[PDB]
Structure 1
Amino acid sequence: KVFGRCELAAAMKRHGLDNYRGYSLGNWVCAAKFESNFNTQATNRNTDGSTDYGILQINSRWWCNDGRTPGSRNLCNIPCSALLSSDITASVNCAKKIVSDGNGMNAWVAWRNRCKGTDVQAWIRGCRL
């Protein structure tokens, strides 16, 4: 599923992402825009053999199990395919664990390079919420 910008903002807010760990909703919408272009089915292979999954491009190196990243962790205790569902519940719950691990949203390379320090509120402008 490819979300609309305001559709995704609503779903993230319903699942309690808005200001989670101090990150306003626009931060999460911006991150998903640049990690996946709002596509819950996005996947990308990393150079070390791991893979990033779903609308927030969560990495199998640490967070999910895909059966093909030897030596990795599954800290969210989910199959990576659960991060590709049209329902973002699993991605949100895993993102809450990631952002709580001490580094905040710097765990998302696209947020760090393309959202951090910008006017992220622009990403929820015009949505009802």
Structure 2
Amino acid sequence: KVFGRCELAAAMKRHGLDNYRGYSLGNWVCAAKFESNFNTQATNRNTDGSTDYGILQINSRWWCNDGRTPGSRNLCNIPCSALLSSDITASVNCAKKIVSDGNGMNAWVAWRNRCKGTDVQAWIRGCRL
């Protein structure tokens, strides 16, 4: 599924991401835009054999198990395919564990590179939340 900006903002809010661990809703919508461009089915292979999955591009080396990644830790305890669902629940539950890991949202390079320090509130303006 390709989410529209406001539709995603609404869904992440309902799933409790607004201000979770100190990050306002806009950070999350911004990270999804530059990570996957709002697509639940995006995937990306890396040089180390891992793959990034779904709307928040969660990596198979530390977080989910895809059965083909050397060094897998599966810290969210979930199959990587559950993160490609049109329902963002599994991705949100795992994102919550990743951000509690001590490095906040720096876990997402696109957030780091394109959202951190900008007016992330731009991402939720115009939406009826």
How many residues end up aligned between the 2 structures? Answer: 129
Q: C-alpha distance in 2, partners of 1:118/1:125?
A: 14
Structure 1 residue ranges without an equivalent (≥5): none
Q: C-alpha distance in 2, partners of 1:9/1:47?
A: 32
Deviating 4+ runs (over 3 angstroms): none
Instruction: Give the TM-score, by structure 1 length.
Output: 0.99
- C-alpha offsets along residues 28-78 of structure 1, whole Å, 9 cap, x if unaligned? 000000000000000000111100000000000100000000221100000
Q: C-alpha distance in 2, partners of 1:109/1:95?
A: 14
1:10 corresponds to which residue?
10
2:116 corresponds to which residue?
116
- C-alpha offsets along residues 69-105 of structure 1, whole Å, 9 cap, x if unaligned? 0221100000000000000000000000000000000
Q: C-alpha distance in 2, partners of 1:27/1:68?
A: 31
Structure 2 residue ranges without an equivalent (≥5): none
Q: C-alpha distance in 2, partners of 1:2/1:79?
A: 21
- Equivalent pairs: percent with the same residue? 100
How many angstroms does 1:107 deviate by?
Answer: 0.3
